[PDB]
Design an enzyme around this catalytic site. Structure first.
Site, short mmCIF file in Angstrom:
data_model
loop_
_atom_site.label_atom_id
_atom_site.label_comp_id
_atom_site.label_asym_id
_atom_site.label_seq_id
_atom_site.Cartn_x
_atom_site.Cartn_y
_atom_site.Cartn_z
N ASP A 48 -1.03 -14.87 10.15
CA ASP A 48 -1.25 -14.88 8.70
C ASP A 48 -2.60 -15.59 8.43
O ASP A 48 -3.41 -15.17 7.64
CB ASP A 48 -0.16 -15.69 7.95
N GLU A 71 -2.54 -16.27 -0.38
CA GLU A 71 -1.24 -16.92 -0.26
C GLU A 71 -1.35 -18.27 0.46
O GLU A 71 -0.65 -19.24 0.08
CB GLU A 71 -0.29 -16.00 0.52
N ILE A 143 -0.56 -11.53 5.67
CA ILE A 143 0.57 -10.79 6.22
C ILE A 143 1.68 -10.76 5.21
O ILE A 143 2.30 -11.81 4.94
CB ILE A 143 1.09 -11.36 7.54
N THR A 146 6.01 -11.49 6.55
CA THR A 146 5.94 -12.31 7.77
C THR A 146 7.24 -12.32 8.53
O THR A 146 7.24 -12.38 9.75
CB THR A 146 5.57 -13.74 7.35
N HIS A 240 15.56 -11.86 -0.30
CA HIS A 240 14.34 -11.49 -1.02
C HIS A 240 14.65 -10.64 -2.26
O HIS A 240 13.87 -10.61 -3.22
CB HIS A 240 13.36 -10.76 -0.09
N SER A 263 7.68 -5.52 3.28
CA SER A 263 6.26 -5.47 2.88
C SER A 263 5.93 -4.36 1.89
O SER A 263 6.73 -3.45 1.64
CB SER A 263 5.34 -5.37 4.10
N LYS A 266 6.26 -0.38 1.60
CA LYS A 266 7.15 0.41 0.74
C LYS A 266 6.41 1.17 -0.34
O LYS A 266 6.69 2.33 -0.63
CB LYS A 266 8.24 -0.46 0.12
N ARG A 280 13.54 -3.89 -6.41
CA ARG A 280 13.51 -5.30 -6.07
C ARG A 280 14.04 -6.11 -7.26
O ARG A 280 13.30 -6.52 -8.16
CB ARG A 280 12.09 -5.73 -5.70
ZN LIG Z 1 2.14 -13.35 3.43
ZN LIG Z 2 4.16 -11.14 0.78
ZN LIG Z 3 4.66 -15.79 3.08
#
Ligand SMILES: [Zn+2]
Ligand SMILES: [Zn+2]
Ligand SMILES: [Zn+2]
Ligand SMILES: [Zn+2]
Ligand SMILES: [Zn+2]
Ligand SMILES: [Zn+2]
Ligand SMILES: [Zn+2]
Ligand SMILES: [Zn+2]
Ligand SMILES: [Zn+2]
EC number: 3.1.3.7
Length: 354
Positions: A48, A71, A143, A146, A240, A263, A266, A280
């Site tokens: 990452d 991030e 990433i 992850t 998630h 990720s 999609k 989601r």
């Molecule tokens: Zn990430």
């Molecule tokens: Zn992410």
């Molecule tokens: Zn993360």
């Protein structure tokens, strides 16, 4: 509009996609040394940070004043951990420059030479912008997925450019995406490090094998009418998204067929026309989605002819609220409007019935 930015985005994603593909198994094998638990208990790995380093250094070499919402942060990383980041970047450079070098493109320069541990820390930390309503900034998840990365499964490298709260440009590298797994045919060159998807607002969505990234094929969502024939896209990780409420939506709409993967890959599958609805739903209504989990997908989906909203109100996502989205959940689809509105209102109703 945004020609240089798209070239930079694409090449930065491309090089990071090679690195993350190549290091995945080693990261998994050496998880005790390569993996850190952050303060939200989520993982972050050498990969990452290496991806964030490559991408932000490329942005800064080409646009020295530009702001980045990334991030990750270097705070607390040890010198040993940072040397590992740098070493992975240089190992990747040796493979990349032999095989995939882009003429007349710079990843580093005099100002940002990416040579020392201090350079790495500095570059990672240029991702500390807060975003917001006005002006231009990049938005990066180095990433995405992850946890999927650490399972040896799908992940994505995700970069976007936001201007005045609107995503203008998106680029998603999917280094492990094999389309034959999802019904479809792969393109020549896919095997080395997957695909890149990209879009600029008003100009269309396209993809190419990452190893190519020169010949671009236009993409568009598919339009099924028999909803019973539709395929959902959902995350794998139970924490998630509310998978049980997502299944409730599916039951209610008779959309049985299911793909699960981590990720923004999609969004790429939706945009390519291999699935129909991405769900989601928030487990906890206090959770605010991070912009880097959705920005690149937003413009790619738009340009591919789909629809992208929250999961309750049926409003467009607002990428000018800072590092997070103020709404609850995310739903994307192929449309049309009536189908999208049905999916979202079903989601609303399921959540309201809790
Ligand atoms: Zn990430
Ligand atoms: Zn992410
Ligand atoms: Zn993360
Ligand atoms: Zn290594
Ligand atoms: Zn600031
Ligand atoms: Zn092949
Ligand atoms: Zn499911
Ligand atoms: Zn269409
Ligand atoms: Zn609507």
């Amino acid at each position: 509009a945004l020609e240089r930015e798209l070239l930079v985005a694409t090449q930065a994603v491309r090089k990071a996609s090679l690195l993350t593909k190549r290091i995945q198994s080693e990261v998994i094998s050496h998880k005790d040394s390569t993996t850190i638990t952050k303060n939200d208990n989520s993982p972050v790995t050498t990969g990452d940070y290496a991806a964030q380093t490559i991408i932000i250094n490329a942005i800064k070499s080409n646009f020295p004043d530009d702001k980045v919402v990334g991030e990750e942060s270097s705070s607390g990383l040890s010198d040993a951990f940072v040397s590992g980041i740098l070493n992975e970047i240089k190992a990747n450079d040796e493979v990349y420059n032999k095989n995939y070098k882009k003429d007349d493109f710079l990843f580093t320069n005099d100002q940002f030479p990416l040579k020392s541990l201090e350079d790495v820390r500095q570059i990672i930390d240029f991702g500390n912008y807060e975003g917001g309503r006005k002006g231009r900034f990049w938005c990066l998840d180095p990433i995405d997925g992850t946890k999927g990365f650490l399972r040896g499964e799908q992940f994505a490298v995700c970069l976007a450019l936001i201007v005045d709260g609107v995503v203008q440009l998106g680029c998603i590298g999917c280094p492990n995406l094999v389309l034959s797994s999802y019904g479809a045919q792969d393109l020549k060159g896919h095997e080395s490090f997957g695909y890149i998807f990209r879009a600029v607002r008003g100009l269309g969505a396209f993809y190419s094998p990452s190893s190519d990234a020169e010949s671009w094929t236009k993409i568009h969502v598919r339009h099924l009418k028999d909803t019973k024939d539709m395929i959902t896209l959902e995350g794998v990780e139970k924490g998630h998204s509310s998978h049980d409420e997502q299944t409730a939506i599916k039951n209610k709409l008779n959309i049985s067929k299911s793909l699960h993967l981590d990720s923004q890959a999609k969004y790429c599958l939706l945009a390519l026309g291999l699935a129909d609805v991405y769900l989601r739903l928030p487990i906890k209504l206090s959770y605010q989605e991070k912009i880097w989990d959705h920005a690149a997908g937003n413009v790619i989906v738009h340009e591919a002819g789909g629809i992208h909203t929250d999961a309750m109100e049926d409003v467009p996502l607002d990428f000018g609220n800072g590092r997070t989205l103020a709404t609850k959940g995310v739903i994307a689809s192929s449309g049309p409007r009536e189908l999208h509105d049905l999916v979202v209102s079903t989601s609303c109703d399921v959540i309201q019935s809790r």
